[PDB]
Inverse folding.
């Protein structure tokens, strides 16, 4: 029965090791992403949560019929 | 027989007295046991001899599996999942082996109680003492961990006991 239907314990052991490594890395990445989201939304100094401002290319830099703009 | 180790499961030298007939009457037990021998023990012996002859023509082996020692839970970092996994498996194997040790000791105790008959209260003192020691050690190691036990909870229990013992020793030193 063992020879026909089942493998040795090492296969399940090392597959468990691989699964545990993947899951632990995913958990750490989730916590890191939450912290990064919090910091980026608080400071606004990252790529995320960038809200539009007025384009400076819309300004007319011409004499304006009055010396003081 | 040679199937089991006689030091792990010891027995006394088995002193039995010789028959001392005091009556001219015959012994029905001896006559009945001769009949039982000739009528039961011989055909069974022949069947076993045939079966063993068949077995000897096909001799193959199986082996006891060997496990090396991996680092314990004490040498594992807090979130290192792989080392914790290996240590937890080793701890569970050790727990099973300890249970079997207790089982062996209990078997010795029960066998001695049956063997000694009316003198068991005095003649089983050593087995009772061995069981007391093993039971105390096992209870210290594993009791009250509850369901969902692990190596970490066992380590926490041992640390708590060590702290209590160190405090008691230092307080007795100040006496
Ligand atoms: C001989 C008498 C004394 C001993 C009797 C023992 C009784 C055993 C027979 C009963 C069957 C046991 C249940 C089957 C469960 C096994 C399913 C699965 O786990 O096994 C697969 C194996 O597949 C097998 O083909 C299972 C087939 C069993 C299906 C049962 C069908 C019976 C139906 C009855 C039909 C009879 C006639 C019908 C007339 C209409 C594994 O696939 P694999 O990926 O390789 O695994 C790798 C492991 N290796 C490396 C060891 C190979």
């Amino acid at each position: 029965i063992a020879r026909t239907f089942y493998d040795g314990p090492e296969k399940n052991y090392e597959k468990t090791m691989a699964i545990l490594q993947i899951e632990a890395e995913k958990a750490e990445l989730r916590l890191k992403e939450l912290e990064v989201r919090r910091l980026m939304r608080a400071r606004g100094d990252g790529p995320w949560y960038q809200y539009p401002t007025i384009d400076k290319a819309l300004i007319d830099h011409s004499p304006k019929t009055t010396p003081d703009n | 027989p040679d199937s089991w180790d006689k030091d792990v499961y010891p027995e006394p030298p088995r002193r039995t007295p010789a028959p001392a007939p005091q009556t001219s009457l015959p012994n029905p037990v001896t006559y009945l046991t001769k009949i039982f021998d000739l009528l039961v023990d011989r055909p069974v012996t022949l069947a076993r001899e045939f079966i063993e002859q068949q077995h000897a023509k096909n001799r193959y082996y199986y082996y006891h599996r060997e496990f090396r020692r991996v680092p314990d839970i004490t040498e594992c970092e807090e979130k290192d999942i792989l080392c914790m996994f290996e240590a937890e498996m080793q701890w569970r194997r050790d727990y099973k082996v300890d249970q079997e040790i207790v089982n062996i000791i209990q078997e010795r105790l029960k066998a001695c109680q049956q063997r000694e008959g009316e003198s068991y209260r005095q003649n089983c003192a050593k087995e009772l003492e061995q069981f007391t020691q093993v039971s105390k050690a096992f209870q210290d190691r594993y009791s009250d961990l509850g369901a969902h036990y692990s190596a970490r909870k066992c380590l926490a229990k041992q640390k708590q006991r060590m702290l209590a013992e160190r405090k008691a020793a230092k307080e007795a030193a100040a006496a």
